[PDB]
Symmetry: C4
Subunit: 385 residues, 4 copies
């Protein structure tokens, strides 16, 4: 955190140079009661790289001012003292990586781009004020006029209240018209890309659901089941934000996928009265094999007397347990609990009727994987007997 | 439907405030013969949330006007009485969800965005009329001039007939030039996204078919078969709008996929003289196993004397039945009917020649799935004997 | 082809109305020596639909002019005689389908959109000329001025040389500023979509290859093999335009896929001295089982003395045949010919060394499919013995 | 490299014509002390095609000037001497292919498009200067004014300081307004496509990882494992730039995939004390079967006493070797080395505990492939005994 404070100090240093250097090139009446901050900030820029694509620090290192002021270089040649301002590309690419995951990275790119567009419109406005006719005017009313002019130019508005006069003004205006049109086109392109990728789980997710509403409106379905389907999609949004568990953690390797599934279902694979005291690898295998299913409120998951193969573990929702006639209530289950256990070791029919109560988010276990990783574990085969 | 009328009442209330508040900030000669609608609408905004991301109703609740009018707050400080207008973000996000599936959701987003762009251009025009030089002018000719100015600014047109005069006008014009350029760029980006996703089944579908026309034009094929292929693609558009049945209902879970297939093929799985009186689960299994195939008009589906494995159920088109010499016509089948039934229980060759008549949309049944879910059903094994 | 001439006649009729109706609404001095073409074109529009989403022909049918001219309807009410011009939407959707595959359909959409944008800018310019102050001016210099104005407006340029004067001009200018901004945004969105999907096999294909050049540049590979790989990608472009045979004809049904593969490899499955005299279905099965492989110039496909399983059929390139010591040349094969035939019936090792000569595009046959569809064909088992 | 110098000479020749021909059409006072470069450059254009979609060289070949100057052709008919400038399309499509892989091809398309947009804005400006009123003005102040005008037009800015005057100027301005709007829309579309495809491995890769951060932020995971996962994604970026080895070289054919894998893992498949002296084909088979796995720093790959099946070859990272009690350190392995060798020939349990040390990038070998291609190699079965 002392290099985070160092990055903050370096950003303040390069900001100071970005605000000062074009202001003392236009106004050479400055820089004289402000050289000490030039010395301190230059030492900061030359001492940052030991505490950290290479020529920005080297070009920022050399004293490109003080030469203008001791040798009185003319107007088109003094301007190379802005070479220190190439360092801002390096500080940009560093600040775009030092804090790239506390917040969204696209909002980071948009704020860095808006910063660069204002800070280059500043330099272009500074160039315009440099090649202006000399006249008495407050350097504020000449910042407001230069900035007003270069926004009239950058925003493709065009009042025409201030126009080029000399040919070398007309050439400077032509060239900054091309760069202004390029930069403003870049601004429109980056904003349309930043707002194109601004909603991802809710956009694609919505599209998916939508792809199913204009269809279920195509089949002319009754509105009760269609609203129930829509409330299903509302549930899976308002629980996992549209994302599928097995397609988020399919872009991971096997050890990392194992660690993520154990961390996600840690006190879940422990919710059970069944996997406690089991082996560590066994738990991983189980997780590497947990399958989620979702029952809406009131759905029949299991009817007592069916064939039945697989065991069910409740994770999030509730459920109720009914007898074979679905008249006598055995119990009512909730998250963390489990049913279908009398189907794995035995080819018996269902012993209780299982109606959903709310949306469930419940895990199921297939028979082949369970009896494969149960034959080799004796202690859970006794935990289940 | 009394909360749909409540949402309509709340939208009318927030619209009234959105039209009134900036009109009484600019013209303080109003609000005096119109306070009663302020009281009624404020009670509506403070009583809506009990009949329903939280600070909009709280900021809308407090009397931010009446303070301007009793204490005569100055021009840059009275303007905080527009804080009630942050409620419109909440009403926007509520009205974008209460009626999101009667119509397309993208047309909904486009209408909400156009509404927000006009209603913010209204506020910016109101700000311009606020910081204008005071002069005698009808408040209509000052709405037409303020709205004409702020559309000249928002539409990057730029006549230059009305320009800033004071420096604080030039700063206000600069800042609303940046916001106008941002909002107009946002308008172009959202319109290009709304018309990019405006045609989906006909765009992607067309592309797919196209990907096959520039290819079949690449192989230099005769036009008769290529037109027949194109009329095939015309048929599958003009029947199911390009969508594949099994990739629309593959984004559903198993119980929902079962319910949708039973609802789609309900009086289809009943069209048969074969699945009536069958089991409920059996029907589901059958559906969970129905496979669609499409024969164009005149195609040979079955020639009598072939080997033959699988049974065919007609769903939509017609077909004709010919004898083994394809000389003596047995019958002619239509939708709902079926052929190939003398191939599942027996390894006999075809008993009739089956020529298509129109485009068919016909269902077929593989042998392994059929004999697997037929061995365990005795009554359909007698229905088929 | 007499309905193609009818569509051409109808397009000429609706074009004539689209050029005439707004020209006689602005200039009522016309229409009097030109009623006969109105009668003929109206009969054409009312007789087209018998030789062919329904209300365009009905609204085009009724005499909405002649009422303006006999009853002298005022300026805001006469304008409903433009209702005939809604027919152009129907003619657009008909002409966008009658010739949708002689040329690309996207170039068709772009030309129809540019046509609609000019033809609506014509109507808006006509509206501007309608609500102009009456003054003496040639109707050409008033078309050039109205069209110049409405392009200055539609192209977000904004000279400001002609501006609204009356309030009802300012409202008309405001409303056509909103529509002009909407239409010009639509133009930018459709052009960016038309040029986004303009290159498909060469864009995606290039990307695929590229995804392999920045990688093979990542592994720091020697340039000879990388250039050979790139010339491989150049070959598969400059032969089949990037498209994979089995992913173009995987979006087809089985009978259509069989017909396309037989048509593609017709005198290919006949190139052989092996499938001639074979069964018709057998040929289809063979095709339904032909597998393409591509050997670059000089590659070793088979070395004599290897194990060898599968037979190879040359389709496009050349190859050479060497002895087991790769010293004595047996022969040299070309397209249409075949090797590896002494590996299917027998588990013998290679009998000749097969070096590629150019890029090959050669077909191979696996052993299980070949011996499965060879056991049931006796005549080819003798053709191969 | 003498045809690379020939392409450079031809580009210089066609550039000279592209700068000269519209300059001598506007100013006919030129061309007289500059005919020799016309003769030399015309000979270069007519002699290029022997040292190299056909009509550009033929249209460039004929003397379309000298006719203007000997017969004094009038203003709308002399202009066909610009027909030589169609050759630039051929030189464009040639220069877009002669150096398409030293640098990115998209940067090439962007530079060619910017070149074509400036070089056509030059011709349109030349047309404007052609149809101007004749007046005394330096041909520089008339290039700055014509170029300033045609950028005011091309950039949708619109000062309105110079406007059409005659009707044939208004028609020329209208037509170049349509082309300017089309070209500027094309510029915005190509820039948004060039910056849309500008980041591919880092964009898609980032998205993939992101698709896993907003999810692992969804499961509310502890930050230590999530940061470790993120540093995993940082490692696989900062090693292979996001690309998967087996999906880069899956778009290759089998001989090319074999050559690339042997070139990538050449002194890798030789790093081993195991595949040296093995067969050439065997090595290829091994490579055609090498599988990469990645262990983070500190992960347990193998615990001594586990079952164990497969052998591991270290490629990049480090690892350490521990005894069965994980108390006594056997050794510590690094890249190029290998473990798990006492699991292939034997069904013994692990003999040493293998903890990762850094991120590994290590290769593993499954048992079935290894014992399949080991049964048929006797010498490596002795190298491993």
């Amino acid at each position: 955190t002392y290099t985070l404070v160092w990055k903050v100090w370096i950003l303040a240093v390069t900001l100071y140079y970005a605000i000062r250097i074009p202001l003392t090139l236009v106004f050479p009446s400055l820089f004289s009661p402000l050289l000490p901050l030039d010395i301190l900030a230059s030492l900061a820029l030359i001492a940052d790289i030991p505490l950290d694509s290479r020529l920005p620090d080297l070009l920022a290192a050399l004293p490109l001012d003080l030469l203008v002021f001791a040798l009185h270089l003319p107007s088109p040649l003094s301007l190379l003292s802005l070479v220190r301002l190439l360092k801002l590309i390096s500080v940009q690419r560093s600040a775009t990586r030092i804090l790239s995951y506390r917040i969204n990275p696209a909002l980071l790119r948009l704020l860095s781009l808006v910063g660069f567009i204002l800070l280059a419109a500043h330099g272009i406005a500074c160039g315009w004020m440099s090649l202006q006719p000399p006249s008495e005017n407050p350097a504020g009313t000449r910042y407001l006029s230069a900035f007003y002019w270069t926004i009239t130019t950058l925003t493709t508005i065009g009042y025409g209240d201030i126009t080029p006069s000399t040919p070398t003004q007309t050439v400077y205006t032509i060239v900054i018209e091309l760069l202004g049109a390029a930069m403003y086109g870049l601004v429109i392109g980056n904003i349309a890309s930043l707002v194109s990728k601004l909603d991802a789980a809710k956009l694609l997710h919505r599209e998916r659901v939508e792809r199913v509403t204009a269809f279920l409106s195509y089949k002319r379905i009754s509105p009760e089941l269609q609203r129930r389907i829509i409330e299903y999609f509302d549930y899976l949004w308002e629980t996992r934000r549209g994302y599928e568990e097995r397609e988020v953690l399919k872009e991971l390797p096997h050890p990392l996928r194992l660690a993520v599934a154990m961390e996600i279902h840690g006190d879940v694979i422990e919710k059970v009265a069944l996997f406690k005291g089991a082996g560590e690898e066994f738990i991983r295998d189980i997780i590497l094999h947990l399958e989620p299913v979702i029952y809406g409120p009131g759905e029949y998951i299991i009817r007592a007397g069916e064939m039945g193969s697989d065991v069910y573990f409740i994770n999030r929702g509730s459920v109720e347990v009914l007898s074979a006639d679905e008249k006598t209530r055995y119990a009512i289950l909730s998250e963390g609990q489990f049913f279908g256990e009398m189907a794995l070791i035995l080819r018996a029919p269902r012993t209780a009727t299982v109606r959903a109560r709310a949306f469930c988010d419940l895990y199921r276990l297939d028979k082949e994987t369970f009896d494969r990783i149960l034959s080799r574990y004796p202690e859970i085969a006794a935990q289940i007997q």
